[PDB]
């Protein structure tokens, strides 16, 4: 619900009592499907500003990875904004998570801005972090689990 003369647009909370976007929200996935058009226009501009951590609560999703290079700078916002623009009241695209490619040496890294990160430990197929490398240095070493 929008508010007059410069007042925050209240986001109708669960109990059915419009609350304000600058806070911590829990988005029952289904909701996020018949609502993105809104999400992206009021809560999204908010999350980027770094003032409204939101938990999209979806049971078990498919998950696309995207390894970028920690050397160079990157801002994970568009590989997310796009994912949002592909959510119909019908179906959502496999949640995409950006992940730095694990380096061998101790490289200087560019401050990247990330947003998507799962709560449950869904890193169960990593297998190995730097097969050939004599030792991973910046990436997350993941010695072949015995």
């Amino acid at each position: 619900v929008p508010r007059p003369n410069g007042l925050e647009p209240q986001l109708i909370d669960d109990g059915n009592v419009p609350r304000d976007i600058a806070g911590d929200w829990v988005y029952p996935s289904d909701v996020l499907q018949v609502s993105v058009a809104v999400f992206r226009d009021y809560v999204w501009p908010m999350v980027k500003a770094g003032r409204t951590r939101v938990l999209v609560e979806l049971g078990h999703y498919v998950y696309t990875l995207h390894y970028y290079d920690p050397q160079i700078s990157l801002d994970e916002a568009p590989i997310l904004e796009e994912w949002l623009s592909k959510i119909n009241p019908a179906g959502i695209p496999p949640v995409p998570f950006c992940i730095p490619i694990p380096q061998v040496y101790p490289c200087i890294t560019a401050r990247r801005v990330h947003y998507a990160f799962t709560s449950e430990n869904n890193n169960d197929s990593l297998f190995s972090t730097n097969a050939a490398s004599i030792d991973t240095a910046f990436g997350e070493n993941a010695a072949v689990s015995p």
């Binding site: 904004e81 401050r111 990247r112 801005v113």
Partner: protein, 43 residues
């Protein structure tokens, strides 16, 4: 300005691409066109 590798790139906090009617929602390409919805339809 010195183009370089690392330099914490940060997306615009409000997508400059489209412009939503705040009263209604009929979006617009250029900010300009959105002034017309708010000056015409909503006035």
């Amino acid at each position: 300005v010195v183009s370089d590798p690392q330099s914490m790139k940060v997306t615009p906090i409000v997508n400059p691409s489209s412009y939503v009617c705040n009263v209604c929602n009929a979006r617009f390409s250029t900010m300009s066109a959105l002034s017309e919805h708010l000056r015409s339809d909503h006035r």
